[PDB]
Amino acid sequence: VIAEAYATKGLCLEDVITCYEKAGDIALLYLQEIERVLGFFLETGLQRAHVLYFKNGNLTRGVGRFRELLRAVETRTTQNLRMTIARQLAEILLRGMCEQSYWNPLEDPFCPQENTEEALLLLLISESMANRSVVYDLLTIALGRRGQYEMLSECLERAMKFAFEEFHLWYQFALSLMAAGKSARAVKVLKECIRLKPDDATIPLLAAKLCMGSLHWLEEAEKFAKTVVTSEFKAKGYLALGLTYSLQATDASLRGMQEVLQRKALLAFQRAHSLSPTDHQAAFYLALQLAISRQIPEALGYVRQALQLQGDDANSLHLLALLLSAQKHYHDALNIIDMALSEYPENFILLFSKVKLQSLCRGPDEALLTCKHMLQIWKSCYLHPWMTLAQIWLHAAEVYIGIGKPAEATACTQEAANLFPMSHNVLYMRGQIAELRGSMDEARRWYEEALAISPTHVKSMQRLALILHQLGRYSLAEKILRDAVQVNSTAHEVWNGLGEVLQAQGNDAAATECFLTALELEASSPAVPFTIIPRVL
């Protein structure tokens, strides 16, 4: 009675917001009191306070009112009101307030001490009372700015139930999945998104991006990239296609397949570059495929273009350095690596290339110092970054092997082995150490172990085949080297080993063929395999 009385006074007075406030408070107390033991006047009294507060242009009072109504103990009638109110206040929190302006609901202008906290709370309560589409958008916003994409994926997953096959929620769910790191589910939901809308090329491009990455679903990636095929998204489409083709070529089993796929990749990259001569991704990847095909001058030209577009691209600089090393310009290459490193000090890959280049033109001490530097950087920076550390130690070991110091090499490889005892790289290095020490049978067995773990390790194949060749078992050595040729036909050491086997067997023509191939290949061999540069969208 008193509540509707103050409300009525507020009405007749239409100072007013005060009467509406009192009416609201007494109304809540009245409703609770009822529940212990619907109103028009009660509705107007409860609601039209904060309304006139916001109409006034005063935000603080409105927020205060919202918090007052929300702090009230839940009644089975005030639940819907509390829902709409919580939603609106969450909106106001996210869009109209920042961090430095926020104050606790208990504090004068679980109790959330931060803005995003209270907003999240209100949104969750709203969604809960909604049980049995704006709130989810607000959730995507609040968790989006804070990088909480997993929880977001869970929330949007809770949203999927009520929804029909509509575009926005499903696409949002897919994106949240992709951001959260759940690649496979994201790919599926994205397929369904292409199903819902075939207009947007961003969706198959994203799917292709995921497939090309960690999942390594190259076939699916090819399918999506094909689905994509505006000039920019067509360029991106052919780019993704070329990346897929290249990766597949790396994965390809036979030389025929490899060459076909590499040529296809080349074509797709050329098309992508002609579609958008400003997109340095396409230019770079074109240059990279050309590098892989041992077309060093062309690759150099397109690298120069890609660098004219983006002068500080780490991959572009790195490829430039590798191409220079391919032309046996080790000092220039090293200078350029040092440049990229002046722009990218934390980059481990660049540092590894620096190590190799220093071993090639500067000497062992320098490269060892670069290894120690990498070790310091690794300690300061810290899944598998352990593989990186192992590679640091193994690189140091390669330096010591190169010199002729089996003890230090054994030490470094032993650090790597503390990390990964049965790494094929570690096993290979144990073989190298054995060869250095003179124990050839031990070496043989270590390479056998390495190939047991990694049946395609071309280095282990070379060494094992060489050992067998020196043992007199030519047929076996040849078979091994043929497998090796299938794994990587650009490996000149393989062709030399093969030529030596064939020559030993009395097959001189084929042997000289092999030797020639080895010479032409070593003519354009980079200090580091071009494939060290990741092929990603």
């Binding site: 929300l70 702090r71 869009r95 961090e99 302006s101 679980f110 809960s128 916003i141 700015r145 920019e232």
Partner: protein, 231 residues
């Protein structure tokens, strides 16, 4: 003129701004030094005074970068600000201030940097933009406008849409991190409901555009949410 008078010149805390903007746009040192000196002091109003020029400074930095004072200022303020920013995630299973039935880090910790490099510079800029978003309410309408225009220009610079937007100057694609675009979207979302509807509209559209071209899931996600939530 007026700028020089400002240079030569608590009570202090409580046309010059436009002239300073013009100094930032046109290629300066004493302005940057005085702004850094402002940020160095304790009083928050000076912090806010420098913070309004932050977006234009960033845009100038990136523009010069495409084809040494501003970078020094930005880096100095960066070091000044850098701390771990964490917020608790609410659970309905626990009684709350509003109803009856873990700390997470979104930014930190950032290291001290003597020099700007290609990798760290966007950690730096993203963090600075976060600091900008933290004090968004105290930001004047002009600064919000500059923020929107700059987000747009950065997003579409080297791309065909630049010519559509009729932005004139340097037409080079500026490489941008994903988190940077997210922090953009915070300020754009704020600008949407504070009188800058049109500029926030263009900025949002361009952010979506670039996020589609860059294949960035999170900015595309947040901006999609913002666009869907719009009345």
């Amino acid at each position: 003129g007026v700028v020089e008078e400002w240079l030569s010149e608590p009570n202090y805390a409580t046309s010059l701004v436009s002239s300073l903007y013009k100094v930032i746009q046109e290629p300066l040192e004493p302005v940057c030094h005085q702004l850094f000196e402002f940020y160095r002091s304790g009083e928050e109003q000076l912090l806010q005074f420098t913070l309004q020029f932050l977006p234009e400074l960033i845009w100038c930095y990136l523009a010069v970068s495409a084809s040494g004072c501003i970078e020094a200022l930005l880096l100095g303020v960066y070091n000044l600000e850098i701390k771990v920013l964490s917020f608790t995630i609410p659970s309905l299973s626990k009684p709350s201030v509003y109803h009856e039935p873990s700390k997470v880090v979104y930014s930190g910790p950032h290291p001290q940097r003597e020099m700007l490099t290609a990798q760290n510079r966007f950690e730096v800029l993203t963090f600075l933009l976060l600091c900008y978003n933290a004090a968004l309410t105290y930001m004047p309408s002009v600064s919000l406008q500059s923020l929107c225009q700059i987000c747009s220009r950065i997003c579409v610079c080297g791309y065909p849409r630049q010519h559509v937007r009729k932005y004139k100057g340097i037409s080079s694609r500026i490489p941008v991190s994903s988190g940077f675009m997210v922090q953009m979207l915070t300020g754009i979302y704020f600008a949407f409901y504070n009188g800058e509807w049109d500029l926030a509209q263009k900025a949002l559209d361009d952010i979506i555009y670039r996020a589609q071209l860059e294949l960035y899931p999170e900015p595309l996600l947040v901006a999609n949410a913002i666009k869907a939530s719009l009345p």
